[PDB]
Symmetry: D3
């Protein structure tokens, strides 16, 4: 049950990802064989729940691509449920300060290091108690990634980076640009500057910078600055744009 | 993506509605062709979730009847998820004061006017970014209806009506009568008086009064007093009572 | 595991029924408490399969109303699957002659009386081998009802009535009227006479006549004539018509 | 309930299509807004059934793109069920001769023109008896497309083209090439000639030629030759190839 | 709608239970016929939600085994939703003090005794208003069981036992042992002592002690000390261990 | 895409199996980790379809246990659909003679060796055209197992064994005993002799004998005799019996 995504980040190996919002175990398997290092199962902005996350994890399992799950918010109860169905890497939205980052971390760890509720007999996480000493091994294989999405979060970045258990910090350009006054449009120089400065700062602390960016030139720019988990497209977008282009070429 | 239900309320056109608690995209389509101005998809008192709301919205889409969705509570996270699958008109339960009404409104609006999280690439709401300038157009087509269900809420009605973005105020007779000490039985004169006084007061402020009432005489009475969104039946009730009556006529 | 619907037909007690086309375990429970003697789960003209039949049987189980299932056709494989999830009373469409009636009967019976495949360990039918001597008790509690829907079938009715195991014969006025050249108008005198004559002939043979008819006056006529399983309405119709009428009363 | 796809074929307007194998009502809606004239819901080679077809029809309904459904085979029972959930245009696989083409046609038509079973009260097809005179209007809006996939079928093409009710003939290059001894390589000259000759012959008979081809140059050739319903891509392929290419650009 | 599990506890009749984490209405029915007094539908540590709880309640209904439901946390909104689909006995996790116990109780009761929201027309709980005077009868048939899972909870046990409406107190050995510093391993003498002392103390107050324990010797020991609701196994464990043992016996 | 179960039979390595009738992707994963060589997903006697087979295959995929699928009957259409979602090993019920065995084999093979329809772009089988030369590699990795369940089939066994492509012959004791006049009691000497003799004859022909038997002593006897794929239990039975026994130990 070693977390290979977590190990790759710690070793400074950049991980190229794809965002999954189609909310389907079928398309999830199809995309799990496409060659990405990681796949983001979005429980915040796509119609997913614990049950559909579970089936997407099952679909993805035999492939090399590693699953990352985003809960709808920094909720210890939801986090608990996602962990028990087998989630090991979390992308937690709207983390505003060090306290909230710490809460996210503690929600993924069994006491005394955290408040994770025990239910291994019932959980896919322990393979229903087949994994020996699961309760002792689980904490170390949890990978917690926190999203900074506001000016407030940006101010607090230094303290957030000081939180043990925070393995990565993800910058969401859409929410960030909106909070900065550019209505979801990240292209503006002020937004780009904040993003790139944060990436440098995150990597400087030894933690992993992450971002979602569909512009491939910007993706490489972010990678060059030291970003370690970079999602470079979204399944819904890839499908819609390719279908639209195709239709247009035939009038 | 113009909100026609919202426009109708603002123009003082009464909207006749049906409550949907069958939690099925199939019966939802069947009822969408029955001639109602609006349909209430109940996520509070029927076994619905974001996923089943989505399929009921899809079923209803091609019909003239306009969908309204009730979340299980005034939860910004749940509200966010419902909006992204395409919800534009919300009926928010247990709004007790102006602060809570304001929170409901802000949960439906992108910054700076609100705290709505951005995820349009993934969302049916923007038709996966097919709607041009979606982020700039969305706020104005959101219609927020708040429920007053207690004596406390009734005291605070004047302040609630002062909240910008509150387009309508819905009175729930069941909860209200229970809170007033008449165990869900709204017939009592004290309950009726509170209801009718509120309706007059709501309309006086230029906002839309709403109510659910299965008694058709009371429905017309409420309409006469200026109610603008009136649900006049419930799918489960219509089905159960008609089936029971039918069976009884054959012994 | 006694088939009470079968026993009632055999004792000449008329059974009043409702047709279920909403294909939902939820509305199925709601209607199971409405007071009908039987409920028809329609696998021919509603979007059902073995799986949704199963969930509707589970929903109905604790209520007095007895379930009857209609497969999409006289198919031994499908019949086998429906029996194993617990179906004891079948309504088989488009039975044209004695050979086809005999095939329907034999599909429901274990060898040597029939060709029903054995899989009791797996099946809800035996409550997973919890019912003692299930393999010996099963055959006698199967109730086979065959549909006559064409002039050819009407002609072969005497022979169909002579098939052992055919417990009842159901007349579908819609299909019959269509075959007679009056598509969708069973009202025509020639159709009503054929129906009346069939009902009398069936009852005189010592077997149960059945029919679906939404017109309550005709239903009572057929009951007067000796029909023993009479469905007097359809769930989709009850709901649609009640809803449309309600909407109309408010313009 | 007018069949606009059928009308377009009859008027000689070419229809550009996309194949749907993702078996999801969600991705179906996403693609329904992409600008295609028609969408093929594949019940033969994708994991669909009557139920998932229904939800995909509901998702597609409000969009301009017209749905076409392929049953798993030329099965009158399955065809009956697909029609009742609202299917008006069918693509029937493995039609080998005129008799089988005639059977396909008659499965879609009410007596006396066909053997379609009557169940309008229950069916989305008539919007639950809300469409007036449905039983009289239905036959004329059915559009039957038959697949020729073997040398035997090619030989019988003249006779198949003479069957009234066969509105179009579709050539499946994959199956045809396999039958001709070039499994999975329609590129071979002998195959292309057979395809071209069939298209010309179909169009000259006054009926619509159809084909699926992912190669955009060949698609344009077949259109040049007079093909009237041409699917130019497959959803699973578009998604898989776009995703794989994206991943490859980042190594 | 009498709560027989609740009555049995009040009468001091021990109830033997099985834990359900397979999250399936099918296996739930299979196990409902296995002879247990109660069944725990786990919404905290198994992938269940309100919808799947509903279908498991439907599956279990006709059997003697009584359903108990565990929500994911002490959430009044979730509790409301579970009650309306028909839940009457709740096992509430992580109850730390008398205030939290009181909140749990009040969430299950209609005003004035609680804050339960009224929606009986829509609810399976009232059988869609078929149960006469449901609103007046419901409160008394609610059975609230609270879990004590930490040292803090243990300190507060005396006050928790003083809370009216708390019918039972459940000790979770896994969480408790973890909080005490024995990583989910309850065997340690310190854990066992706390557990047995609590059981004696709970029963002394006239309330029901409960526990889950797969060790059958420990189960009888707890019963001897006065425990009244004792779950003696878990469906996932029973299945996994039996399958593993079987496979091993054949190499 | 190599069929390891097929290779093992061919090499004479006995394969120990478990029957899956719980029809759940969740319990399927749980059991896939229990150490069996193969798992039988039953589409004949459990409520499965192509869709649930697909999800069970996805759940099982990362585990060593190899999936085998039983269609509801020897149906080329259904077989086609099962193969396209990725089924490589089939257990075909009620194969009565050599012609039917040959039909089963040809349904699994692309022309000219068979009649398998081509749809690789759409199918999980080729991982959506990601497996190179799939159309050329597929035939050889198909493994066809036929069930003999009647005296007629026993009589035709020598001819069935002569059909190329029949890799194994499975004896179902329940159905066979029923056909021989001992319904549900394979224990009878005449039945055991028929079974033993069939196993020997199958193995002597150079093909794999198979059987399901819950009695562990008989299983070992059949293995001794040369049976190569032996299912030694059923998931529903294991669960039901373990649960019932546990409940009984507490009275
Ligand atoms: O492109 C989108 O709108 C969908 C994904 C975002 O919500 C990802 C995110 O967290 C962010 O960058 O704000
Ligand atoms: O009639 C019912 O009980 C169902 C709907 C209510 O919850 C609607 C509501 O909000 C209220 O009037 O309290
Ligand atoms: O009223 C309808 O058309 C719907 C149900 C029929 O399929 C009933 C039937 O079997 C028949 O009357 O032919
Ligand atoms: O491209 C593929 O192989 C997938 C779709 C086919 O089934 C289309 C078809 O009907 C044919 O070309 O034989
Ligand atoms: O055995 C398990 O881990 C599954 C069930 C527990 O979460 C039950 C519980 O509440 C407890 O004893 O901590
Ligand atoms: O034990 C049972 O009856 C359930 C499984 C059978 O269908 C297995 C089978 O194929 C046979 O033995 O006839
Ligand atoms: Mg964001
Ligand atoms: Mg209310
Ligand atoms: Mg009929
Ligand atoms: Mg083809
Ligand atoms: Mg616990
Ligand atoms: Mg068998």
């Amino acid at each position: 049950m070693e977390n290979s995504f977590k190990a790759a980040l710690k070793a400074g190996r950049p991980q190229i990802g794809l965002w999954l919002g189609l909310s389907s175990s079928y398309s999830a398997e199809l995309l799990a064989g496409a060659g990405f290092d990681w796949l983001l199962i979005d429980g915040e902005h796509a119609p997913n729940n614990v049950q559909t996350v579970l089936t997407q994890l099952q679909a993805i399992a035999p492939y090399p691509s590693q699953p990352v799950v985003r809960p709808s918010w920094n909720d210890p109860v939801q986090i608990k449920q996602l962990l028990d169905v087998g989630t090991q890497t979390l992308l937690v939205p709207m983390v505003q300060n060090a306290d909230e980052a710490r809460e996210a971390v503690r929600a993924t760890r069994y006491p005394p290091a955290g408040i994770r509720g025990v239910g291994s007999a019932l959980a896919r996480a322990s393979r229903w108690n087949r994994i020996p000493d699961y309760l002792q091994k689980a904490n170390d294989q949890m990978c917690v990634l926190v999203q900074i999405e506001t000016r407030e979060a940006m101010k607090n970045l230094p303290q957030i980076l000081d939180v043990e258990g925070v393995d990565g910090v993800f910058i969401g350009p859409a929410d960030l640009s909106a909070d900065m006054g550019y209505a979801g449009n990240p292209q503006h120089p002020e937004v780009q500057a904040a993003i790139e400065q944060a990436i440098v700062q995150i990597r400087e602390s030894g933690k992993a910078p992450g971002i979602l960016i569909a512009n491939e030139q910007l993706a490489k720019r972010y990678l060059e600055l030291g970003a370690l988990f970079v999602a470079v497209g979204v399944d819904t977008t890839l499908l819609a744009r390719a279908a639209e282009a195709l239709a247009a070429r035939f009038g």
